[PDB]
């Protein structure tokens, strides 16, 4: 979604460095308003003490700070974040995962599903629409930029993923749960008036395609499991709640005390808190990761991209069970016909590359 | 790709010491240039310190550099690169494994697509092509080496990867996204008219050939889903914020201040900080494994070497179901035939490796 | 069952502040006991020290406070709490995906158990209802929630669950041992009785039906592990140790000592000990969440939702195997019947989300 | 159809500097790798260096270091090469041809 | 680098005739070879490119051979056009260095 994967192919000298100057999807656009928020009570707290406390506020202040910045404890917010973001990145990934992908039924249903004419196209091409329509319908459930594009049933049916009919069907069957399961059920069906119309040759086929529909339900499932079953709140709570005592122990205890009292560890005043802001962009940014990665289907810059997903989906889908059943190219020799080990070419860039065959650590390279 | 399997194969006295004195992909080429700046940058405030500042500016370096020093914490950072390094190393391995191998499919292939005449021959050896082209397309798609080679859909052509007939027929096919799945629907369509044309039995030996077949895509489309979902940007910029963050405070707090002013902690000038830079190898070296395993399909000297893959598959597949179709050796009866516990021999070198049979912990060793 | 999934859909400024006022599930919930106690004990000690011992007697106490909170000490604490919870919410997810959903089976059932008659209803019927049968048993073996509900075999019949005629075959099968597999063994027979009756085709599709049983078997059989084995205890008591170890330490250790005596650390009195407060709330909250997700089948707020899921399940499953078998909708040509390469609509609110299509990282975006 | 058209022919004076051009059409200039040849009467063809439309990446020839510069402009679909401190060996016909394993086509000169 | 040693200099036939040019490496390029044919004041034209492979327009009186250090271009049954310069090229790294050339006249 914000892919940088070429930026790092290689680790060249401003290969992470480079990244600091990226906007999109970045730690200033995530810390934004926080970081300000945090600017200001500190400088405000700062001018507070430098111009408006008396000299025995002063002391009691200058006591306060020492008090609290004893209680900015890194190695225990570190632990916490690290865990809990561990385990964040971890549903994140699982998530994107569970995204269904019509290719592997796709593959099936224009091979096995018999017919050059109108009503093997119209077969086929309802097959997959099957397909597509379970995932649209859970991805609409479970991912606020879908749900904008889709936010009543009858946008599903304008955008020419369920037809009229079929949303008929749709609501004659009464249910007070997520009917998401409906067309996973039609295509079963429909595969098994397929083979028996004798569109699909053997049961081995059927089943086959049935299994790959199995599997893609199987996805539909977990997509909405990860959506119902949160991270428990609490363990959500108990980081934030770590993270804040740390910023709040900062906001008081980072303050630039009288460098005249000579306090052992505040020699210096130079009013702006360097480290202590990079300890905040580190922290409520290390924060931020899960923050954003929480929820992938949200509208995050980093968050998936969904509905380019579904767009692609479609498009594939139709086109490879429709334009390209047993539609193949002009069988040819292939250019290594006569030639046992072949020795495919390198441009001059890509020479360095061609390597002899590793055969085992065991071997003498010779 | 860098492998050095043989060399810690057993654990003597110098198994890993041995490896600081190597060069390729070691972490001094990764570290060379940030390092000179790291030290040209040091020494060069050491001096202003030492030749340029007057009395009482020296006074506030020392006051500044304890400021710095007291910043300059590696358990925050050691847990953040330990964490994220880790997601890094667990791609890294997945991206691996999703580099599909023709070797499943291509026994398959060989042995149930029948024919010894010219045609079954052409038919094996297509299909095989098919799936080859299915990994190629999608491997220059996502390794900077491998598209070097092929950066234009003629490279593949012209390669002997593809028949200009297919790219004809590839061509055809309008689409506007990436069309790697295109010949894996080739593969499923050709395999049924092969299956319809008698050359393969079965139903169950053609389904079982679209399920490899099927395994495959989905190869392919794990390294499409790594290069395209990127770990997050904010995840990998608190790392190196972190970490810069580090050296920042290591710059002026690890200057050796007047040994004279006798302060805690700086009683010895030494000059050169020895442990310092020790560090610097540490955490920045820490930080180039993931620099460098983040695109595991770059150039880098550890990324893979999937060019050579492409080679050895390409040679491999069409030999097994080609030049080795239903051609076998001649039955033997086995040197074991009437021997019912074989004892096979043991080198001179290798006779304190034959070990009695372990029946379990349970047993007692009599 | 506390989803606050759509609360956190993007990384705004409140995402994870917002959820620190939310009471269902919440920290605050679990620890309020706890904390009040802690609260006590504290501030009981405080006034001991205050109002009753004497000059002599108060240093001995503060002698004991710098002993006690010289062994507070979190690193420790916060090493075992990380990897534990990270067993138990492990374990957590586990259970989850490891309670049985009858779709897979349903798919199958509704569309390969032939019949538009009442004994091809019936058949359908009853298979599914075997499922949920084996399912229902399991769970209330090892749900609280759904035991409550299930308190007898009796209540399982009358809520329709379970035929009286098969309670008098499950009683007739004399077994010690948990019942739970029985419907799952009748399910299997059932199914083989169905197919020697013609109503099962291929034993391709039998077969087919008797592994998603089996799945289910292994569904079952987890969720009966989980229960059985506990997280070994002496583990559990560890870290319990550990952390009332803190507490204890606390308790003495963290109370403000004469700010006369100018102890070092001891400078300002302020009678409440935020931080030490907010430590309490972080670690016993770190703790709440394995205490709450120990045992994910319990009467927690966070714990899963098993008695929705079992009424859902019965809606869905008999519906789907029934009104739905071989029943579809008229098919028509799709919208996209003329069109290769589809264009669905966006709302005005989602057009930025319309993306060109992701190709590859290596590839030139132009 | 394939078409590269370089830049008209040049006279100088010594120390001084050039920059020709060569235009490519009727293919995707970022899809191939762009090369430049010096041909001298009676010596065989110097491979000068290479250049990578996409990301401008250079390569050149370890004899021509410090005499040649190479880059592109995207946007026009034409390669440029500059030759510096030019003496009266640098006086030639400089090809720019596309590579595809091979090189297929080539400029005028 | 890699040396290209192309021979004959210079090659006198008639037409009708079957000429041999060969071209040799300083190390083995494999297959990676070009062959191609310059007409005086011309731009150079490709005629075989991977040793053996003739590319579109190449009449089938020219072919290509060899492998690893030794290569060679032949042309049977000349005709008049076939008449001007002729050098080889590796592809096998870089710089791809190319051969001295051949004179082909009647």
């Known amino acids: 979604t914000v892919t940088y994967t070429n930026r790092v192919a290689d680790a060249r000298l401003g290969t992470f460095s480079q990244l600091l100057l990226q906007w999109k999807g970045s730690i200033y656009k995530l810390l934004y308003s926080e970081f300000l928020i945090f600017i200001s009570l500190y400088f405000a707290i700062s001018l507070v003490y430098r111009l408006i406390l008396s000299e025995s506020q002063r002391l009691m202040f200058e006591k306060l700070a020492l008090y609290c910045n004893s209680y900015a404890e890194l190695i225990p917010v570190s632990f916490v974040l690290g865990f809990y973001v561990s385990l964040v990145v971890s549903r994140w990934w699982a998530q994107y995962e569970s995204i269904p992908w019509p290719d592997r039924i796709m593959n099936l249903v224009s091979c096995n599903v018999d017919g050059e004419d109108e009503y093997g196209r119209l077969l086929r091409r309802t097959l997959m629409r099957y397909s597509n329509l379970c995932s649209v319908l859970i991805l609409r459930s479970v991912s606020t930029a879908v749900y904008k594009r889709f936010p009543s049933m009858e946008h599903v049916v304008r955008a020419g993923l369920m037809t009229p009919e079929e949303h008929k069907k749709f609501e004659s069957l009464n249910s007070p749960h997520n009917k998401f399961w409906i067309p996973c059920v039609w295509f079963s069906n429909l595969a098994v008036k397929a083979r028996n119309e004798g569109r699909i040759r053997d049961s081995v086929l059927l089943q086959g395609i049935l299994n790959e529909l199995n599997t893609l339900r199987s996805q539909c499932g977990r997509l909405y499991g990860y959506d119902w079953i949160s991270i428990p709140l609490v363990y959500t709570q108990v980081v934030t709640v770590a993270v804040y005592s740390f910023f709040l122990a900062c906001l008081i205890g980072r303050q630039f005390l009288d460098p005249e009292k000579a306090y052992p560890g505040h020699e210096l005043d130079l009013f702006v808190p360097v480290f202590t802001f990079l300890q905040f962009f580190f922290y409520a940014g290390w924060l931020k990761v899960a923050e954003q990665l929480i929820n992938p289907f949200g509208e995050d810059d980093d968050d998936f991209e969904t509905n380019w997903l579904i767009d692609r989906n479609l498009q594939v889908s139709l086109m490879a069970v429709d334009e390209m059943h047993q539609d193949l190219p002009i069988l040819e020799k292939d250019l290594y016909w006569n030639e046992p080990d072949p020795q495919p070419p390198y441009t001059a860039a890509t020479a360095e590359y061609k390597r002899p065959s590793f055969l085992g650590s065991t071997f003498d390279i010779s | 790709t860098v492998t050095y399997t043989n060399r810690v194969a057993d654990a003597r006295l110098g198994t890993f010491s041995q490896l600081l004195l190597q060069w390729k992909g070691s972490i001094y080429k990764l570290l060379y240039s940030e390092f000179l700046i790291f030290i040209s940058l040091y020494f060069a405030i050491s001096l202003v310190y030492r030749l340029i500042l007057s009395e009482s500016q020296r006074l506030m370096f020392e006051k500044l550099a304890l400021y710095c020093n007291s910043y300059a914490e590696l358990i925050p950072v050691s847990f953040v690169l330990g964490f994220y390094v880790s997601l890094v190393v667990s791609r890294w391995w997945a991206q691996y494994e999703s580099i599909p191998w023709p070797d499943r499919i291509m026994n398959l292939v060989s042995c149930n697509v029948d024919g010894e005449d010219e045609y079954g021959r052409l038919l094996r050896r297509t299909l095989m092509r098919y799936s080859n082209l299915c990994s190629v397309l999608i491997l220059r798609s996502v390794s900077t080496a491998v598209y070097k080679r092929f950066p234009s859909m003629e490279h593949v052509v012209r390669a002997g990867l593809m028949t200009p007939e297919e790219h004809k027929k590839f061509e055809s096919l309008n689409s506007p996204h990436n069309k790697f799945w295109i010949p894996c629907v080739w593969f499923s369509n050709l395999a049924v008219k092969a299956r319809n044309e008698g050359r393969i039995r079965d139903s169950v030996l053609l389904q079982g050939i679209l399920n490899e077949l099927n395994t495959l895509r989905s190869q392919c489309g794990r390294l499409y889903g790594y290069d395209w979902i990127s770990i997050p940007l904010v995840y990998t910029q608190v790392v190196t914020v972190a970490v810069y963050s580090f050296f920042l405070a290591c710059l002026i707090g690890r200057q050796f201040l007047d040994p004279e002013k006798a302060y805690p902690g700086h009683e010895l000038d030494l000059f050169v900080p020895v442990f310092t830079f020790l560090q610097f190898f540490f955490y920045a070296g820490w930080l180039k494994v993931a620099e460098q395993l983040i695109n595991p399909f770059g150039e880098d000297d550890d990324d893979f070497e999937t060019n050579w893959l492409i080679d050895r598959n390409l040679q491999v597949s069409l030999m097994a179901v080609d030049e080795m179709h239903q051609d076998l050796p001649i039955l033997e009866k086995d040197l074991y035939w009437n021997e019912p516990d074989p004892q096979p021999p043991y080198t001179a070198a290798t006779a304190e490796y034959k070990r009695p049979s372990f029946l379990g912990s349970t047993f007692d060793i009599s | 069952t506390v989803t606050y999934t759509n609360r956190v859909a993007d990384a705004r400024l409140g995402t994870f502040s917002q959820l620190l006022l939310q009471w269902k599930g919440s920290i605050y919930k679990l620890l309020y006991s706890e904390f009040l106690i802690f609260i006590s004990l504290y501030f009981a000690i405080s006034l001991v020290y205050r109002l009753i011992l004497s000059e002599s007697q108060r240093l001995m106490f503060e002698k004991l406070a710098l002993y006690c909170n010289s062994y507070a000490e979190l690193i420790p604490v916060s090493f075992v709490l990380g990897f534990y919870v990270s067993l138990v919410v492990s374990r957590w997810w586990a259970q989850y995906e490891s309670i049985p959903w009858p779709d897979r089976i349903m798919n199958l059932v509704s569309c390969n158990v032939d019949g538009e008659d009442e004994y091809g209803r019936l058949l359908r019927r009853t298979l599914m209802r075997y499922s949920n049968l084996c399912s229902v048993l399991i769970l209330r073996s090892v749900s609280t929630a759904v035991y409550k509900r299930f308190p007898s075999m009796e209540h399982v019949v009358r809520a329709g669950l379970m035929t009286p005629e098969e309670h008098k075959k499950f009683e007739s099968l004399n077994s010690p041992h948990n019942k739970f597999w029985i419907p799952c063994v009748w399910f299997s027979n059932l199914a083989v009785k169905a197919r020697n009756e013609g109503r099962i085709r291929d034993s391709v599709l039998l077969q087919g039906i008797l592994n998603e049983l089996n799945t289910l078997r292994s569904q079952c059989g987890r969720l009966y592990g989980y229960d059985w084995i506990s997280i070994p205890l002496v583990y559990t008591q560890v870290v319990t140790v550990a952390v009332y170890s803190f507490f204890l330490a606390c308790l003495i250790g963290r109370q403000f000592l004469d700010p006369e005596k100018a102890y070092p650390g001891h400078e300002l009195d302020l009678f409440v000990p935020v931080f030490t407060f907010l430590q309490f709330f972080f670690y016993a909250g770190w703790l709440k969440v394995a205490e709450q997700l120990i045992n994910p089948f319990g009467e927690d707020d966070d714990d899963f939702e098993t008695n929705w899921l079992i009424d859902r399940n019965l809606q869905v499953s008999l519906m789907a195997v029934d009104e739905m078998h071989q029943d579809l909708p008229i098919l028509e040509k799709d919208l996209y019947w003329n069109e290769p390469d589809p264009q669905p609509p966006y709302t005005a609110a989602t057009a930025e989300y319309k993306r060109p299509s992701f190709l590859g990282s290596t590839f030139d975006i132009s | 159809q394939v078409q590269l058209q370089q830049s008209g022919p040049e006279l100088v004076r010594p120390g001084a500097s050039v920059k020709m051009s060569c235009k490519a059409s009727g293919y995707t200039f970022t899809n191939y790798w762009m090369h430049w040849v010096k041909q001298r009467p009676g010596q065989a063809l110097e491979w000068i260096g290479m250049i990578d439309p996409s990301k401008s990446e250079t390569t050149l020839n370890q004899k021509f270091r410090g005499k040649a510069t190479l880059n592109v402009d995207k946007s026009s679909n034409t390669a440029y090469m500059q030759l510096s401190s030019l003496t009266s060996e640098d006086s030639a016909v400089y090809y720019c041809?596309?590579?595809?394993?091979?090189?297929?086509?080539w400029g005028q000169g | 680098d890699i040396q290209m040693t192309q021979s004959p200099a210079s090659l006198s036939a008639s037409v009708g005739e079957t000429v041999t040019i060969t071209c040799r490496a300083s190390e083995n390029i494999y297959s990676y070879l070009t062959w191609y044919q310059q007409k005086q004041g011309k731009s150079p034209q490709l005629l075989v490119y991977?040793?053996?492979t003739l590319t579109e327009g190449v009449p089938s009186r020219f072919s290509g051979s060899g492998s690893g250090t030794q290569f060679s271009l032949k042309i049977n049954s000349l005709q008049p056009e076939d008449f001007g310069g002729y050098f080889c090229?590796?592809?096998?790294?870089?710089?791809?260095?190319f051969g001295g050339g051949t004179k082909l006249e009647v």
């Open positions: 090229q590796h592809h096998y790294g870089t710089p791809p260095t």
């Open positions: 041809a596309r590579e595809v394993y091979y090189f297929d086509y």
């Open positions: 991977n040793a053996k």
